[PDB]
RNA sequence: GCCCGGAUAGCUCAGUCGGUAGAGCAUCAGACUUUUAAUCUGAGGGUCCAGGGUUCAAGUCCCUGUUCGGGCG
C-alpha cells in the first residue's frame, strides 16, 4: 500500500534503533566529491577495475536496479551529477553483510559507498563497494518522475523535492547567486563601499507602497519594514562617503501574483560628482560583461510565454540603443504633443486623454496626464524594446526627487533600462535642494493623506541633512529578481526565489 | 545663533536663487579625485607652480581662513584625505569674481575648485584655483570644535554630522564592510553557495527569542520576521545542496542597550557531510585571516569598558586554544558536579541551585537547569577567555537542534568560540532524526504553552523535509556586529551600525 | 443562479449495447552476476459519488441529491 508506505518505513528505522544499528551516524568521511570522482576517473577503459584505489563518496540513491541476488546497481545523485554503484558480493566484505545491506536499502536514501573506481562492460563509470553504509534513510516514497516533476504547487512549496527531482533549479539559483557576485564585483573595483541600512523605520513615508507595520514593545511605537534604502544612503552621502552601494530585500504589504513578492532583492548605489548620463556607461558594462560572464556571449533566448511560446533572441551588445521619450513618441504617434512647460496644464491633461483614448489606451479611473503618459509609453514605447533599451527623458509628473532638466523644462533627469519590454534599471540626478526636497515631500504627504490630518508621511531628519549640503550626486537601482529572471529564461518569479511566499493552504 | 545663522544663511541663498546664479548646478566634472591628488603631486618641492595642469576636484570645505584681501586658504576634505586650496588674486580669473567668490563661501560649503597643482614655501600640496564653483551650500552652522564632537546622541542619530567632523567613523564602517567581504571571500573559494531565505515566516522559529509580528492585508495571516535562516538552510540542504551560506538579517523585538539592536547582521552557513570537529579548523582558518587581513598582524589591543580603560592584548595565532564546558569545569570548581550524561531529574536542578548559592552568583528567577547551568559557565569558564578559546560540547538540555554525542550521552556536539569574554561564532552537529526532531519540537511547544516567551513551535514542514532524508550536517553561526566591535575597539554595537535604532526621543 | 460532462483500485484510463469489475503506473514478494526508465513472474488494492425505480440480473437503462470541471450569469 503507498500510503501506508511511509508508517512501514518508519516501522522499519524504529527496529533498526532497537538492535544497536543507529541509521543516523554522526560522521562520514567524505574522502572525494562525486565531480572529482568523475573528473579524474573517466578515462577509464570499460571493464575496468581499479582494486589498488579506495574511495569513500556519499550520496542519496535515486534507483535500484536488481540484476540478481548478488548484483546490485544503484544509482548515487549529488552536485548535479550521477554516479552508479556497483554493489557485487564477490567484492563485498562478505555475503551475509551484502543481503543486511542490500535488504535495507531505499530510493532516496542518502548512504555512503567505500570501494574502488570501474567501469561495466558497457562503458558506465561506476564504484564497487567494499561497504556500503546508510547515513540517512528515507521515509517518504520518492517518486520515479520521468521529465521531472511539474505539478507547479509542491515544486514551490517544497523547494526540497524540487531540487531532489528536478535539476535546472540548481543551475537556475546558481545563475542568480553568480549575478549578485558579479554586481558586488563589479562595483567594489568600481571604488564603492557596501552599507547595510535599517530594515525597520519609525516613519513610513510619502511613497504610495503598502508598508509593513511592526509594533515594538520595548520602545512601545509601531515600526515600518524598509520599501528602499534610498534616504539613508543619501544621509550618508551627505556624510562624505562619495561612492555608496546596497544589495538588500525590501518589502511590500501588496498582493502576490506572478511577479511580485512581498519582500524582493534589489540593488541600489549612489554615486557624488555623477549624473544620469554617466551611469548610463556604467549600466552599459555592468549588464553587458555580466550577459557576457553568465552566459558566456551576448545573445540571449528568452520564453516570455514559456518553453512552448515566442522565443526572443535578445542582444546585449555594450552599444546600448538610447531614445528620448518625447522625441520617439513624436515618431511613433506622428502627431507632436504640447510643450513641457505645460505638463501641469489641465489642457495638455485633457488633449493627452483624448488621444489615449482615440487609440483605445485604457488607464486607471484617475485620469491625471501622469497616467496617461506613462500607459502611452507603455503602450508604445516599451513594445519595441525588446534589445536592452535606454529611455531618456521622463517628464516631471512622474518623476519626485529627481533634478529638474539640465536644458529642457519641466522634464526630470532620469534614465530607464528596458528589457524583454521590461524596465530592469533605472537612474536619477538628485534633487540636493533642501526647499524644493521639502516642498516635495509637504505635496506627496499631503497626497498621501488625500484629506487626512497629514503632519506625516515625511522625514524631517532626512530634509535636515540635505541643509548641511548634499554634493550634486547620481542614483541608480535595479531589480535582482526581474534580472534573474530574464537570464535563467523564468517568466515567473517564483522560479528564482527559494522559498516563494504562497497563500496558506485550506 | 544657530538658528541665527540658519535664518542668514537661507536668506542668503534664497537672494542668490532669484538672480539667477543657481547654488545648485547639475554637473560639475571632476577630473581627479582626492586621493589621486595627494598620490600624484606629491613630488613637487615648495614654491612649484604647475600652471601647464589644469585639474577639477571637489570637495567641502573644513576651514576657512584669509591673510590678506587677495590671499585665502580654504581646507578641502574628501575621502579622508585634506587639501588646501590656496586662492589669489592674481592667479583667479579677475578680482571681481575673486572678491564675489570669496564673500558666498563658509565653512562646510561643499565647493568644486578647478586650478593649477602646486606647493607653497611651507611645503603642503596646494591647488591655485583658475575658478571656484559652489557645489551645495550648508545652511546650518557646523560646530567648530577640535577633537570632533563628543555628545554621543547627537553622534548616533545624525550619522552625517559625525562622519563629517570625526574620522574614524568611516574607518570602522571600511572594517565593517571589509569582514564581510572577506567572509564571503572565504566561504565562496571553499564551495559555498550564496542564498536569500525569506525574511517572514508564517510561524515563529529558528531561534530562542521573541519575533516581531506584522500583518500581511491581502492574505489575511499574521506573518513573523526573520530570527533564523536555520530551517530554511537545512532545507535546502535536504534538497540537494552540500554547502550553503547566508550573510542576512534578524529581527529581536526585545531591549535595546549597548550590545543589543533590534536588527542585527549574523552569518550562517551549514554543509553536508562535515562534523562540529570538522568547523573548528575552517573557524580557525576564517577567523586569524580575517584578522591578519585586517589588522595587518594577529595581535589585536581591545578596550572593552573605553580606551581610557585597561587594555587587552588578544593574540589570533591559529593554534587557538580548546576547553570543554563539563570537563574543565570541573577541574576548575574543584567538586564533582551532577553527572548530568543521564541525570536530568529534579535533583540534578536542586544541586545546581545549590551549587549556585554555594559560589554566590545570581541566577534568574525561573531558576531551570539549562539557565543555572549557563550561569555557572559564564561565571566560571569566561573570564580566561581573553585570547580566541575553543567550548568542546555542552549538554543536550541547552541544545534543541544539536546532535546528541557520539561517546558521551547527556552532551550534543556543540563548540562555541570566545574571544575577548564574548562568543562571536557557533557551530552544531545538525539534528537529522525526524522523531528526536519532533519530539524535541513538541516540548519546545510545550515549554511555551507554559509560560516560555522564549521557545518555539512545531514546524511541521520542516519534519517534513527531514522524514526525506537530512544528510550528516554541520551548522555555524557568526555575530558579525560584535566582531565588527572586536576589530575596531569599539565596545558599544551602535558605533559599529550605521543608524543604531535609539529612543524616539 | 441555469445547462452540460465525469464521478471506477493509491494515481491515470477501459469497462464496449448489463452477463461484472479490467489495463498501465505506484507498493509488496520471487527469478536472474553487467543493468541504466532494467526485464519477466504474480499478489494485494474498488464496491463502482449517494439514494431510489426498470430489468432475471444494472457502474455499464432512467430520475433525484453531493462534488468537481466547462459553458451560460
Ligand atoms: N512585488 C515586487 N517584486 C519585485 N520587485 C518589485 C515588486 N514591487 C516593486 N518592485 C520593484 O519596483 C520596480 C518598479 O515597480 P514600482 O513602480 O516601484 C511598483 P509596481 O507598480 O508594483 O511595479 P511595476 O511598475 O513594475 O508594475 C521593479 O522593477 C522592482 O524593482
Ligand atoms: N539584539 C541583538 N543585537 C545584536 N546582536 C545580537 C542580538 N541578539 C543576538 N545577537 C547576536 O547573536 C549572536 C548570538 O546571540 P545569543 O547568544 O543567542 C544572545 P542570548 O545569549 O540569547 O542573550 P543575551 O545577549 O542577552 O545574553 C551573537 O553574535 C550576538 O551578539
Ligand atoms: N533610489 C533611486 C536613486 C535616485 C535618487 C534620486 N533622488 C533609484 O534607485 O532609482
Ligand atoms: N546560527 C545559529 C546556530 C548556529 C549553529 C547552527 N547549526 C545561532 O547563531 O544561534
Ligand atoms: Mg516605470
Ligand atoms: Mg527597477
Ligand atoms: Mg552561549
Ligand atoms: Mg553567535
Ligand atoms: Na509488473
Not at 558566456?296 to 555594450?318: I, L, M, N, R, W
Not at 516631471?396 to 529642457?408: F, G, Y
Request: glycine share 6%; with cysteine.
Amino acid at each position: 500500500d503507498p500510503n501506508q508506505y511511509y508508517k512501514i518505513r518508519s516501522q522499519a528505522i524504529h527496529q533498526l534503533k532497537v538492535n544497536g544499528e543507529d541509521p543516523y551516524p554522526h560522521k562520514f568521511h567524505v574522502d572525494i566529491s562525486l565531480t572529482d570522482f568523475i573528473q579524474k576517473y573517466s578515462h577509464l577503459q570499460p571493464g575496468d577495475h581499479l582494486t589498488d584505489i579506495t574511495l569513500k563518496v556519499a550520496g542519496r540513491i535515486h534507483a535500484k536496479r536488481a540484476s540478481g541476488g548478488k548484483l546490485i546497481f544503484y544509482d548515487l545523485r549529488g552536485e548535479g551529477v550521477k554516479l552508479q554503484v556497483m554493489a557485487n558480493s564477490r567484492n563485498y566484505k562478505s555475503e551475509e553483510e551484502f543481503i543486511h545491506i542490500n535488504n535495507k536499502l531505499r530510493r532516496g536514501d542518502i548512504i555512503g559507498v567505500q570501494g574502488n573506481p570501474g567501469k561495466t562492460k558497457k562503458g558506465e563509470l561506476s564504484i564497487i563497494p567494499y561497504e556500503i553504509t546508510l547515513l540517512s534513510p528515507c521515509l517518504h516514497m520518492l517518486p520515479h518522475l520521468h521529465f521531472g516533476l511539474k505539478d507547479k504547487e509542491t515544486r514551490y512549496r517544497q523547494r526540497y523535492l524540487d531540487l531532489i527531482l528536478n535539476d535546472f533549479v540548481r543551475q537556475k539559483f546558481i545563475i542568480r547567486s553568480k549575478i549578485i557576485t558579479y554586481i558586488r564585483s563589479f562595483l567594489d573595483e568600481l571604488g564603492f563601499l557596501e552599507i547595510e541600512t535599517p530594515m525597520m523605520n519609525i516613519i513610513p513615508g510619502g511613497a504610495v507602497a503598502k508598508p509593513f507595520i511592526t509594533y515594538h514593545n520595548e520602545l512601545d511605537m509601531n515600526l515600518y519594514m524598509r520599501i528602499a534604502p534610498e534616504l539613508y544612503h543619501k544621509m550618508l552621502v551627505v556624510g562624505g562617503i562619495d561612492r555608496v552601494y546596497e544589495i538588500g530585500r525590501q518589502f511590500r504589504n501588496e498582493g502576490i501574483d506572478l511577479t511580485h513578492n512581498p519582500e524582493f532583492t534589489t540593488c541600489e548605489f549612489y554615486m557624488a560628482y555623477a549624473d544620469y548620463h554617466d551611469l548610463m556607461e556604467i549600466t552599459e558594462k555592468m549588464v553587458s560583461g555580466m550577459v557576457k560572464h553568465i552566459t558566456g556571449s551576448y545573445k540571449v533566448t528568452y520564453h516570455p510565454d514559456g518553453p512552448e511560446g515566442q522565443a526572443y533572441d535578445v542582444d546585449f551588445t555594450p552599444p546600448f540603443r538610447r531614445i528620448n521619450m518625447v522625441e520617439e513618441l513624436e515618431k511613433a504617434l506622428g502627431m507632436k504633443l504640447p510643450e513641457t512647460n505645460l505638463f501641469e496644464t489641465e489642457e495638455t491633461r485633457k488633449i493627452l486623454d483624448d488621444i489615449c483614448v482615440a487609440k483605445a489606451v485604457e488607464c486607471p479611473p484617475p485620469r491625471t496626464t501622469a497616467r496617461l503618459l506613462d500607459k502611452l509609453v507603455g503602450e508604445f514605447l516599451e513594445v519595441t524594446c525588446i534589445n536592452p533599451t535606454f529611455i531618456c527623458d521622463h517628464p516631471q509628473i512622474m518623476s519626485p526627487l529627481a533634478k529638474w532638466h539640465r536644458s529642457k523644462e519641466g522634464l526630470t533627469e532620469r534614465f530607464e533600462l528596458f528589457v524583454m519590454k521590461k524596465e530592469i534599471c533605472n537612474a536619477y540626478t538628485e534633487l540636493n535642494d533642501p526647499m524644493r526636497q521639502r516642498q516635495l515631500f509637504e505635496e506627496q504627504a499631503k497626497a498621501k493623506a488625500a484629506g487626512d490630518d497629514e503632519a506625516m508621511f515625511i522625514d524631517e531628519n532626512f530634509c535636515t541633512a540635505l541643509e548641511y549640503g548634499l554634493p550634486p550626486t547620481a542614483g541608480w537601482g535595479m531589480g535582482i529578481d526581474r534580472v534573474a529572471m530574464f537570464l535563467t529564461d523564468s517568466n515567473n518569479i517564483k522560479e528564482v526565489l527559494l522559498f516563494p511566499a504562497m497563500k496558506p493552504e485550506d
